[PDB]
Design an enzyme around this catalytic site. Sequence first.
Site, short mmCIF file in Angstrom:
data_model
loop_
_atom_site.label_atom_id
_atom_site.label_comp_id
_atom_site.label_asym_id
_atom_site.label_seq_id
_atom_site.Cartn_x
_atom_site.Cartn_y
_atom_site.Cartn_z
N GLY A 1 -5.21 1.31 -28.06
CA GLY A 1 -6.23 1.34 -27.03
C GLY A 1 -6.20 2.62 -26.23
O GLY A 1 -7.24 3.21 -25.95
N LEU A 2 -5.00 3.07 -25.85
CA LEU A 2 -4.87 4.28 -25.04
C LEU A 2 -5.42 5.50 -25.78
O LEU A 2 -6.19 6.28 -25.22
CB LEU A 2 -3.41 4.49 -24.65
CG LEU A 2 -3.02 4.14 -23.21
CD1 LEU A 2 -3.25 2.66 -22.94
CD2 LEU A 2 -1.57 4.51 -22.95
N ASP B 1 -9.83 -27.49 -54.69
CA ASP B 1 -8.85 -27.42 -53.56
C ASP B 1 -7.72 -26.46 -53.95
O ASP B 1 -6.85 -26.21 -53.10
CB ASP B 1 -8.32 -28.80 -53.18
CG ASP B 1 -9.27 -29.61 -52.33
OD1 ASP B 1 -10.42 -29.17 -52.19
OD2 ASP B 1 -8.86 -30.66 -51.82
N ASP C 1 8.21 6.04 -20.06
CA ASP C 1 6.90 5.79 -20.65
C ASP C 1 6.49 4.34 -20.51
O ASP C 1 5.42 4.02 -19.97
CB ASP C 1 6.90 6.18 -22.12
CG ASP C 1 7.78 7.36 -22.41
OD1 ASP C 1 8.96 7.33 -22.02
OD2 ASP C 1 7.30 8.30 -23.07
#
Lengths: 419, 418, 402, 389
Positions: free
Chosen positions: A409-410, A36, A274
């Site tokens: 993403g863009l 553990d 923007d």
Amino acid sequence: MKLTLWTYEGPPHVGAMRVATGMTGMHYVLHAPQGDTYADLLFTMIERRGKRPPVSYTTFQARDLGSDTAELFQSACRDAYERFQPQAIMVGSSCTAELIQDDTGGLADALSLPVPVVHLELPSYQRKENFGADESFLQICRKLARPMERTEKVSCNLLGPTALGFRHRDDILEVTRLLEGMGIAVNAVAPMGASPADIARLGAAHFNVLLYPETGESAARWAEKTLKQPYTKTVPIGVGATRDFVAEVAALAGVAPVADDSRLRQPWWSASVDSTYLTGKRVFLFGDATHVIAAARVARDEMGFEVVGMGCYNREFARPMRAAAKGYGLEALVTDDYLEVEEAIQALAPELILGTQMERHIAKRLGIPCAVISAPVHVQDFPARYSPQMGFEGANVLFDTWIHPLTMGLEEHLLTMFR
Amino acid sequence: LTLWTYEGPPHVGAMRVATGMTGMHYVLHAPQGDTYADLLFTMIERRGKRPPVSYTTFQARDLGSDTAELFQSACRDAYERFQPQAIMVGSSCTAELIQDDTGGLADALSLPVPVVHLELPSYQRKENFGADESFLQICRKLARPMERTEKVSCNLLGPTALGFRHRDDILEVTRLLEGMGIAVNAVAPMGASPADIARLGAAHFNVLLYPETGESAARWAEKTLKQPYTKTVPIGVGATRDFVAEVAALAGVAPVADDSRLRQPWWSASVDSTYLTGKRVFLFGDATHVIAAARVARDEMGFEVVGMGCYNREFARPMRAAAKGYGLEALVTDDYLEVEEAIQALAPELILGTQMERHIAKRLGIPCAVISAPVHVQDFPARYSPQMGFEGANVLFDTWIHPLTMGLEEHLLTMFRE
Amino acid sequence: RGQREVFCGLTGIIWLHRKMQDAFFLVVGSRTCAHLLQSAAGVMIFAEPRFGTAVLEEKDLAGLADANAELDREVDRLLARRPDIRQLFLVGSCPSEVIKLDLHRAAERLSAHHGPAVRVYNFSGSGIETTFTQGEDACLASIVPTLPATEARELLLVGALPDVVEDQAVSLLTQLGIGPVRCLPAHHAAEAPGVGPNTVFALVQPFLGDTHGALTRRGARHIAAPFPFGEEGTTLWLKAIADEFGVSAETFEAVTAAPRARARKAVAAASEGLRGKSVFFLPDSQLEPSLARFLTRECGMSAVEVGTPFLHRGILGPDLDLLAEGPVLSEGQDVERQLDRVRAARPDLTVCGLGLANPLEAEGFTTKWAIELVFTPVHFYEQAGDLAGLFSRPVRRRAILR
Amino acid sequence: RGQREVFCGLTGIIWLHRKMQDAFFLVVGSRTCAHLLQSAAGVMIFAEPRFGTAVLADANAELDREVDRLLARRPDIRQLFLVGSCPSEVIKLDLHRAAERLSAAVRVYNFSGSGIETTFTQGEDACLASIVPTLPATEARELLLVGALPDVVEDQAVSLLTQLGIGPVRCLPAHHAAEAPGVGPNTVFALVQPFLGDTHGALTRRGARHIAAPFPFGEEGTTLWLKAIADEFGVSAETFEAVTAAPRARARKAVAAASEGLRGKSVFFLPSQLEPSLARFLTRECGMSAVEVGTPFLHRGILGPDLDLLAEGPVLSEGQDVERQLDRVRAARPDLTVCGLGLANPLEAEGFTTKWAIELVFTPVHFYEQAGDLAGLFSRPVRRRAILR
Ligand code: PMR
Ligand code: PMR
Ligand SMILES: [Cu+2]
Ligand SMILES: [Cu+2]
């Protein structure tokens, strides 16, 4: 017995050790079966501390069953006391220790070492990491902190920042800066960077700042009930909530609300030309209850993109998320299963999903921009830099951390599918 | 045939400088279309002020001495607009290299010092000397050898607007200096006022931030104002400590250094920071940042520096100085095609540098981060992102290792379930 | 007999399922084991790996019939969702062991109704009776009794070693040419071996302390040789194998210019490496006694300590013979006294299970991770050369960092 | 007059490159041009675009060298169009001279969108005009449509046009090199694109007659455009209206459903060249109390239906200076000062809601669903201002 291939928050003993390794001079002897001790790797390897997460396990084996494991716990606690000489011993168990009925309380209580002994007997099959941290820190204050004479100046004990947590180290600094610039003195910064002496010193103040409700709400409510210090309700996450917190504590302390705004760039960086394509984006917000609750406020009011769907795996803080959803007329996903977030964001396909690291990888699978604003994270999300999330710099960090998935993403789209 | 240009034209740097100087103006003969850079400091570095730099925009019906008349017309109108504090003259050189400079009406203003002028060399410059011939003129003219104030004071020299995270470098170095006991008279290159720039005598020593723009200012100020600059740079833990040594040596004060915050030396000592030992790393970008980052890499990071080329080849010798420090040579060319070729040849695992190298490595699969100047909107951040000081060394770890997180977790995902 | 730093065998699943691509390691246990598997796999838990990691709730904690009933229903759901799993693996855990959950009874009851479509094997990774990489051994000892019985005299490659490791082993073997090579880890049915009374358990990995006994119960024989972990370890392992089969030494020394000579060259190509420095082996992988000998003879190790989770007399016997008598095979090793001994000795290496790697790097001591070693291909000839470099690299990390 | 505001002609290169595929758009000059293109593009420069940027007798020799360098690095160019810029026309570098001399399959054509001569979207004008001259004449009644309107909507325009019953189209922007639009005396051509004054002038100069051109921006903007098309080709009213009423209904519903928050507005048009056409587009839906509408280049010409259908409220000031136009803006206080350039975002920084032109130019806004989101484009700054005040 469901196939939970990913737990959202680890075992609550890990959260307990987040409080432990936060305070200098506080040692968490744990009655964890050998192995553990991965959580030691968690603390020295995710959060990267240059000191054995001072959680001295017992690591009992099959040879150490029956009362042998209790004898090993006695031995480990004694070796910790005569080896590191902590100023207050801190005891607790693990899942398997609960399965042995290992009773880490009475053992270290009968050890009779002079330093304070706190117990951490918290459920592990019903709760998770954040509850472990919150309950452990609350019990720490309950045993050590006592009502004493207030500081001659106004003081503002920070409550909530544990050691292992998504950007606690930097919001502790940001809120310290806010309080010191406005006029209040940071008496203590428990439980991260504190000590048993600092826990005792928590009593000398006038209000108990609630930074992280998930990890310190119990502590703040107990302090307001006992230390006679009204805990601050609104957390400094987001410009609106930052101003709310500033005004609130300027009322509790009765001081002029000086708050340096030369740093705040989120309102301008978003409310501009923007960051107008933001307005209309159908965002989905999962993750840590408080961060995502105030993230909804930032996203709508100060960022622009419309909110569709906002759940949170934290169950004890369900209702504030339901309220933040119903403010915009939305629902709250209050389960702790990753597949549910998956089909939620399929049904409500977003462009910017704000959530944990598992949300980040879910969005990486489907291919939508994703940010990290919540607790379960990796080494990357624990930064060496100044990356706060509470205050005006916290709002700036929120702006940038959320916009970076959108820019990612863009660029990924337009690069090589528009040119 | 640069399809991407690393830095801008030599006028955008002057506009960078003037953006942080509330009042100081610059009369530039730039045709309409050269006013695209009026966007940069509210579009890329999203601020809220039209750049304090005059534009004329002479059209087709305006070729010859008509441009000379428009020089004075624009100068007078710009002065009457907002009552500047200083006027700087200089052209884009296109139709007029040196052939309309007309001070006649640029002087004869309330402006005490009208000789202020920034001429930028023709077709031989980028966005470094645009901001450096700024403080070789605008601080060579309106800065007085004022008495050194009672407490040991200093000047935060170098940071210009539209610069790589300059606004936060300013606060980190100011915090270091104030915690050490060093007063900062003014942050002269950024966030200042012409009164502050006149107050450069009340500084026992200029604190230099980067050669990109403040190197000339610091050298001249030590030569003229008689206040030496910090020859070292606060980029990097060892460099930060040597910088503290220099500032305290010139100050006479204790070298108080808030390394409590500093975590790069430790976070680069964990065993997660052991699998990066010997990782070949390409380092292209501005000289100051490349040298500092490559020292940090080669000694304290674990990476092995296989590339150190640059595009700021003006001070050419100090470039390969560090290359021989690492036993290599410098690719001082000014085209990203050579960067692509070099990273293809050496096939590194980290291509730390501009956003252009960022997109090359995105297109070449290699990991990569931003440590250099030629960056777009996203690397001029809202967050506290200081590249200098102890927190500068701190950010230089996470920024560099996030692309390694890409190149490692992506690999594991694509190799585990295929 | 205090705290010991080493994992539970559940972390063997991270390498186990990467070999047997037709196996699901349905790890029962609590949320703590689940968090171990989650953190250990890191990003792997995100690309739908074959863990399952089914946690037991408090309602599922109490009782035994309810637990196996839910286990049955979710197993059926999983195999319906993923009908491409044959060798099912109901891995135990410390929580599951304390509940005394019978994985063998569950295996019988489940192959009753999954039949040949899903053949289940059961073992343990619980830290109560297992350490870091003895879970591999329990897994292999869970397929050995079910391995196809035969009588043909042949050799094996016991050990769930990487696929490239087995490929190089068999390629070298057929360059020599010795017997029918049957790789014990049955990644699928296409390469299912045949064990029997005339076979041999040609063990490769020292922690394989239970598969040796199991396939002894099969009736086979041992190649009494050091565990193959370098030039001379694998040299003697292979040499003893062929002498058990009778292969001439002419091919031995005629086909071992690229494998053996370059194996020793690559192992001793760590100029800094650990030549003359020390190692203090905490209990990490039942693999320290094997390392010490070839780090001593080839890489020039002092080998102050050879501390191991458990030492097996015979199987590491020849491996122990090449090991120096100075270091002591301390068992049940209490890590605290071991830190005291490191602090006294001031070594240049402190191999451990190492959530105290960074903690021991803070005190200046250099540390190396044997978990990556058990993961990385480190066996036989071509990949032990980088076993040596894998040990060497933290030394250079300290050299450049200090 | 004094300082100017608008972009130079090279900003239309970002659109011309995207629209007509097999073409070259190499500009010449300094980093001021190579960086306007760079920053405006954003990721195009990383996507390896089809254009470039080159590094009196000496200047012409350098021109020849750089044109040969174009022909070298891209050995697949046959219908290239070099782009002129400010330095090239400053030393008066004749791109036609380089094109004609260096044409000796290799056919080189010139174009000069230099902002000293050219303005915001007159680069499109100059390029589409430079397509015309060298091309020979056709001898049939076709309908040579023009303008670099989006191809997705170029399909809609072609579909509607053939539904009218026209013959060949042969659109002037050569998206295929093989598709060569001849300039016929009988060729009757409309105008999709408001900033095609030079193109229309050259097309009528070579001989092609021009149809009345109320420019197509949804509802009446394209209604009267296609009505002129029909009455020029003699398409029956019941034929044209039958095949075009549905696009009208779609655009009318879409603009209304996209401009709900655009009520009570004063849309100041600082100089997109769409200013008269967009000013007319912003009169009927909700409340658009338009105010001064300037342009970087204005001619009524036969492009007059814009002003004919335009009101008198907004001043049609050709030629402007932001250094005083922004003073007029402060005095006017227009609730949406859509500002092409000069001041731009600092307007939003001094309590003036601002829209920007290139969003309108480079986002499909021509009839049907394209002009439907023109209202959304103009609501973008307003829907920002409604919350992020
Ligand atoms: C040449 C100056 C300039 C700058 C610095 C950029 C980059 C960039 N331009 Mg804008 N852009 C410029 C011009 C143009 N932009 C281009 C690209 C682009 C668009 C579509 C968008 C925009 C914007 C931006 C952006 C930020 C992109 C964003 O975060 O969404 C930068 C700084 C962005 C916005 O918020 O502002 C209008 C927006 O949605 N531009 C276009 C074609 C439409 C032009 C010609
Ligand atoms: C239990 C805590 C912890 C964390 C969060 C992970 C992931 C991860 N552990 Mg290491 N790691 C821990 C333990 C273990 N890791 C495991 C796997 C693995 C290895 C072989 C390696 C690695 C590493 C790391 C790291 C660095 C992230 C990176 O490698 O991309 C994370 C967060 C990395 C390193 O050098 O540290 C040993 C590396 O080489 N983990 C194993 C065996 C499965 C376990 C038990
Ligand atoms: Cu990135
Ligand atoms: Cu990333």
